[PDB]
């Protein structure tokens, strides 16, 4: 197997067709589904599977009380068959820790899991089912990483970490691994004030990541990373169509090199495909919560500080709950262009639905079409009254 290569570009995105949906919480009430969160999807040269941060307990067992808490020594990164539920009996632990990312370079997969206490965390980098590198904390304050698949070009897989304040400046680095080994790293540059939970996609030997400015931005920082030169850049989506959340209502004009003010010390992982006129943004429907989800065509959203939607597509009604969301693509599907894809973690339970003591989710993902398909809504589907 040769190392992959971001040879193609994104296809014309006109519609988002359904790709996967594991009714995990539905089935979970009468099956052995693990409690999870922070899911995402990735593909190897012959499969695409779901991934998530398990909580080391199923949904119906007594050990689910307290799963809101997102960091404990009982969490592992587990992977699983596309669209099936994460069941104890079918899941496959990948590494131990409560923050991750994973990409397949062509030859093998690289998985990274971060574990430890807030001030003393470490990231052990597995490459091919074996640990190979470790990196201890630098700012001793919740060393965290992507929470969604990473991208690799000819053997190099850029990946973004952050160690520090989640409500003030911090220290982020772009580590560049090859077969598990650190080829180099570098501190964040560009105009992005704060980076967190980067969603990266690849195409045309260049990686693009859209992240979360938890500190001051309602718009989102972007990082154009070059896999070969091993450099990178940052700024913000100029668009006044704000996509973070919480977020103030939509302005007429937007900020390009500085964060859009109004709401601070909060946000959600999100993503976007920036392809000139071929650009779509994803965002929650509520300006105050992670309820509903939508996709919108906003041409030149990255450069144009006035760009407004020209097409749309709902995914989750406002009344339904969303959560984290990100990108991923089958870099191995036969074709002349990479079909853009994404997933939205449908969050069920606490803090919103507090009739239960747990917090868990289910996934719904989609890929692009060149057809102008009709839209359908995709809710989690479970009835919280049944777990009482």
């Amino acid at each position: 197997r040769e190392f992959n290569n971001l040879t193609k570009g994104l296809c014309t995105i006109n519609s988002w067709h359904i790709y996967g949906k594991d009714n995990a919480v539905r089935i979970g009430e009468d099956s052995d589904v693990l409690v999870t969160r922070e899911p995402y999807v990735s593909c190897d040269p012959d499969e695409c599977r779901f991934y998530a941060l398990s909580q080391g307990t199923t949904i119906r067992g007594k050990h689910s009380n307290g799963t809101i808490h997102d960091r404990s020594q009982y969490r592992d990164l587990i992977s699983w068959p596309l669209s099936s539920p994460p069941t104890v009996y079918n899941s496959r632990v990948e590494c131990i820790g409560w923050s991750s990312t994973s990409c397949h370079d062509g030859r093998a997969r690289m998985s990274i899991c971060i574990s430890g206490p807030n001030n003393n965390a470490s990231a052990v980098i597995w490459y091919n089912r074996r640990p190979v590198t470790e990196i201890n904390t630098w700012a001793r304050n919740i060393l965290r990483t992507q929470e969604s698949e990473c991208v690799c070009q000819n053997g190099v897989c850029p990946v973004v970490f952050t160690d520090g304040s989640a409500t003030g400046p911090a220290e982020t680095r772009i580590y560049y691994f090859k077969e598990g080994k650190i080829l180099k790293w570098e501190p964040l540059t560009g105009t992005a004030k704060h980076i967190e939970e980067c969603s990266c996609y690849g195409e045309q030997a260049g990686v693009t990541c859209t992240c979360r400015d938890n500190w001051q931005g309602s718009n989102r920082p972007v990082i154009q990373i070059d896999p070969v030169a091993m450099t990178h850049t940052s700024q913000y989506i100029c668009s006044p169509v704000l996509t973070d959340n919480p977020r103030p209502n939509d302005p007429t004009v937007g900020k390009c090199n500085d964060p859009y003010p109004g709401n601070n010390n909060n946000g959600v992982k999100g993503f976007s495909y920036l392809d000139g006129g071929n650009t779509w943004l994803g965002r929650t429907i509520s300006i105050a919560s992670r309820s509903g989800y939508e996709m919108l065509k906003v041409p030149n959203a990255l450069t144009d500080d006035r760009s407004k939607p020209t097409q749309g597509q709902t995914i989750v009604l406002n009344t339904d709950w969303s959560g984290y969301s990100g990108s991923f693509m089958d870099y191995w599907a036969e074709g002349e262009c990479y079909r853009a894809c994404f997933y939205v973690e449908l969050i069920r339970g606490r803090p919103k639905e507090d009739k239960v003591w747990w917090t868990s989710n289910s996934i719904v993902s989609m890929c692009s079409s060149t057809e102008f398909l009709g839209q359908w809504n995709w809710p989690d589907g479970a009835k919280i009254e049944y777990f009482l």
Partner: antibody
Amino acid sequence: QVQLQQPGAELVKPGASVRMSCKASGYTFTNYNMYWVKQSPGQGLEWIGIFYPGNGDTSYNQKFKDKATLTADKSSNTAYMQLSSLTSEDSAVYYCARSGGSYRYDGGFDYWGQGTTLTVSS
Amino acid sequence: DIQMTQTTSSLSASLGDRVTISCRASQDISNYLNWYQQNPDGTVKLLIYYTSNLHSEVPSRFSGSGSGTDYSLTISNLEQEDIATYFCQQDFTLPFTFGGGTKLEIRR
């Protein structure tokens, strides 16, 4: 005819708890965020929080994320607000209001109740 | 929070008069500003929303304008029934905030 009907005045002993009934009639209850507002001398008008009957979503004015707990009865079409641990300063006038943007947070408060005046005394 | 500056809590005028109330916001609220009239009993009514949109059944005489940080309500022919307090408010972000208010009175 949107009609947010609200009682005239509440009399409660200092340190107690209380519930603000805000019976809504005139549109699809389940479709509009319901807000609450306090009007007191000095501070003036203040937003307490928001209850969305459609799915129970709530958000509070950080300065009231203790004093108030929003809720609502979908059957009787009433929104509620229970204030915990009443003091002299709690004496003001509380209004429940409907959103112009329905589920959105724009379009101002298109419709207001008449206001409940809360009193704390002995 | 976004502070709503309403400078002038008292405005004398005479019936027939074209009065103008002004409002100020700490930051650029991008037009997400409304105006409320509270008649002397307690009735808080909405007149203009999103800077210039009149609400349903609101006298065609009431005006609203302003951009950036400064906005303003313009009452054309002051009628006795306009002698109330007007409050501007922003809904650009959460939390929502209101200005101090401006009590209209008669010059005699």
